[PDB]
Ligand binder design. Structure first.
Ligand code: MG
Ligand code: MG
Ligand code: MG
Ligand code: MG
Ligand code: MG
Ligand code: MG
Ligand code: MG
Ligand code: MG
Ligand code: MG
Ligand code: MG
Ligand code: MG
Ligand code: MG
Ligand code: MG
Ligand code: MG
Ligand code: MG
Ligand code: MG
Ligand code: MG
Ligand code: MG
Ligand code: MG
Ligand code: MG
Ligand code: MG
Ligand code: MG
Ligand code: MG
Ligand code: MG
Ligand code: MG
Ligand code: MG
Ligand code: MG
Ligand code: MG
Ligand code: MG
Ligand code: MG
Ligand code: MG
Ligand code: MG
Ligand code: MG
Ligand code: MG
Ligand code: MG
Ligand code: MG
Ligand code: MG
Ligand code: MG
Ligand code: MG
Ligand code: MG
Ligand code: MG
Ligand code: MG
Ligand code: MG
Lengths: 116, 101, 87, 70
RNA sequence: GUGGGAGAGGGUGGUGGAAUUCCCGGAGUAGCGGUGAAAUGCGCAGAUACCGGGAGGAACGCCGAUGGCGAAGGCAGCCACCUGGUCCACCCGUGACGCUGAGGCGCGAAAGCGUGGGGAGCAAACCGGAUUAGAUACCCGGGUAGUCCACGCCCUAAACGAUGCGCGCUAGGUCUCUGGGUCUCCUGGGGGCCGAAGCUAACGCGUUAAGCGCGCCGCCUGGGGAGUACGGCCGCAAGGC
């Protein structure tokens, strides 16, 4: 019920999970998907396959809104980050540009013991 | 009395009356803190590399001065009071170190 | 800080003869100038220790120069002290 | 690979107001380039860093950028 | 003395951006998180992911080094001010004014104590989840002191080069920071690596000595008992010498 047809695709990838958000060109999200959205539950949500299927689900839900062009924004590093970009390219959505936005501090905050 | 360079970046969206007013106020502020003005470069509107005060661009002025050291910090405070002034950077002057020379 | 003419005025003041930059009298004078400055800067910034070490060292130097002057010419010593306001 | 300094004239390493030059010392991202890239001497590099950071504070140069391709 | 120089050396004030958290708004559903796998936890009072705005604290990515400064502890955004140390050149002034240093006095990471602030993130204690014969431990979710600032105490440490300070003398080669020079190189001051002579129980050290010498200070005298006891001094306490 929109007719967007051009917009942003954000891929947020951690080691635990992968989530994708399709949004309009001014940043408001249209649809979204994740490892858990498709049937996976545990560790299984971090596989590159899950990332694939999540990209694909999100792109389907995009077609329903009549999406065509996508600007990809990649954040984070985890397995199937690249698999999600991959699946998204061959999804039928024709991507415009891919960009790595991963946030890094200028050293603000103490990390948990696991991260130091 | 040392040799300084006062950088001022103010709001690009000002018209002539406004800009002239902020500028005159700045002049007055220098005269008050005993800053003689050796030279002035006003480059005006330029595109900032990151947005400052929600503006993508800014208005630039540069004043080389000679003023009393003890007053300098105080001078800075005054210049920042104006809302319309987004950046004030005062810098002790240096000789032009050269490279590939 | 201490600038060139600020310093020179003192050198002239305490020099034994024209062109004397090096005598015990002059060294002590200069040292005292520095010392007093530092003491004023340590009345504020009571938390600046690294400078206080410097103070101790300058004070030491002065005392050595003075003990030497006093050992060689006692009169020059008394004179120097009277002028400077030490001890 | 040819160093940044290699293509440039006599230029002020102390000019924080000159972007047309300083831009060439930054990466695809906002980052200040290593000496391996900038060809500068120790002292040179050390000055260029200060100059860059000054310019950044003035909004004339970016603190960070985003990476294309990928 | 004059003239140059490099520097996260120190104190005060100000300012910048990234990120975390929380609050406000839009858009948007069914999960997110997390692990070896999980669960507690959080989510329909709309979370996570995305965009805009705001508040607040703490720490400064790239530069960054095998780098620099400091007597040591230790010091990293940018700016200004106040200030310590130090290197080089000129060979200008004083004329042995030197070295060391029991006691004293001062500085002294972290934790810790007192009074008052501050409190984002992390987090001893604590409260939970799962692993596993079991748990108080390693993994997971929460979490208070604390970590931050002011002032006043505490005086410890693998406070490590496990190497007291100073001066003279004894092959080089090589990488480097910082000066001066008639700048293939030379000369001075730092930082490293190999190695002459020599030293060393060996490992190793070797113009940054652990070599050859001189001066002065501190310290050792088998292991345990024990850094304990008694005593004294210091400390609000912990506790220290
Ligand atoms: Mg997971
Ligand atoms: Mg410093
Ligand atoms: Mg400081
Ligand atoms: Mg919201
Ligand atoms: Mg559930
Ligand atoms: Mg529930
Ligand atoms: Mg925000
Ligand atoms: Mg708050
Ligand atoms: Mg690094
Ligand atoms: Mg180091
Ligand atoms: Mg250390
Ligand atoms: Mg200085
Ligand atoms: Mg002579
Ligand atoms: Mg003579
Ligand atoms: Mg001594
Ligand atoms: Mg003793
Ligand atoms: Mg002693
Ligand atoms: Mg301490
Ligand atoms: Mg502490
Ligand atoms: Mg207690
Ligand atoms: Mg306290
Ligand atoms: Mg925990
Ligand atoms: Mg077990
Ligand atoms: Mg258990
Ligand atoms: Mg437990
Ligand atoms: Mg936590
Ligand atoms: Mg000995
Ligand atoms: Mg060598
Ligand atoms: Mg040299
Ligand atoms: Mg040279
Ligand atoms: Mg050397
Ligand atoms: Mg041999
Ligand atoms: Mg021997
Ligand atoms: Mg042997
Ligand atoms: Mg060796
Ligand atoms: Mg020796
Ligand atoms: Mg030995
Ligand atoms: Mg015995
Ligand atoms: Mg015994
Ligand atoms: Mg004890
Ligand atoms: Mg006792
Ligand atoms: Mg008592
Ligand atoms: Mg104890």
């Amino acid at each position: 019920k929109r007719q967007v047809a051009s917009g942003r695709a954000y891929i947020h990838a951690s080691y635990n999970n992968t989530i994708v958000t399709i949004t309009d060109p001014d940043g408001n999200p249209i649809t979204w998907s994740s490892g858990g959205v498709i049937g996976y539950k545990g560790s299984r949500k971090g596989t590159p396959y899950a990332a694939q299927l999540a990209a694909l689900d999100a792109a389907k839900k995009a077609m329903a809104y009549g999406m065509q062009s996508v600007d990809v924004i990649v954040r984070g590093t985890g397995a199937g980050r690249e698999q999600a970009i991959r699946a998204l390219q061959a999804s039928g959505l024709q991507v415009k540009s891919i960009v790595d936005d991963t946030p890094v501090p200028h050293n603000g905050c103490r990390p948990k013991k696991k991260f130091r | 009395m040392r040799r300084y360079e006062v950088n001022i970046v103010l709001n690009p969206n000002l018209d002539q009356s406004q800009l002239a007013l902020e500028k005159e106020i700045i002049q007055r502020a220098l005269e008050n803190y005993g800053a003689r003005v050796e030279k002035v470069e006003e480059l005006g509107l330029r595109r900032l590399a990151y947005p400052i005060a929600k503006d993508p661009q800014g208005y630039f002025l540069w004043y080389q001065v000679e003023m009393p050291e003890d007053r300098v910090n105080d001078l800075a405070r005054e210049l920042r009071i104006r809302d319309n002034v987004r950046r004030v950077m005062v810098v002790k002057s240096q000789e032009p170190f050269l490279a590939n020379a | 800080p201490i600038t060139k003419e600020e310093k020179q005025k003192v050198i002239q003041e305490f020099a034994r003869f024209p062109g004397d930059t090096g005598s015990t009298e002059v060294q002590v004078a200069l040292l005292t100038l520095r010392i007093n400055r530092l003491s004023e800067h340590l009345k504020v910034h009571k938390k600046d220790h690294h400078s206080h070490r410097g103070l101790l060292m300058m004070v030491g130097q002065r005392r050595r120069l003075l003990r030497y002057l006093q050992r060689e010419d006692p009169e020059r010593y008394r004179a120097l002290i009277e002028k400077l306001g030490i001890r | 690979k040819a160093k940044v300094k290699a293509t440039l004239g006599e230029f002020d390493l102390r000019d924080y107001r000159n972007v047309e030059v300083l831009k060439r010392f930054l990466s695809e991202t906002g980052k200040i380039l290593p000496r391996r890239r900038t060809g500068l001497s120790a002292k040179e590099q050390r000055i260029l860093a200060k100059t860059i950071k000054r310019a950044r504070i003035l909004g004339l140069l970016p603190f960070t950028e985003k990476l294309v391709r990928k």
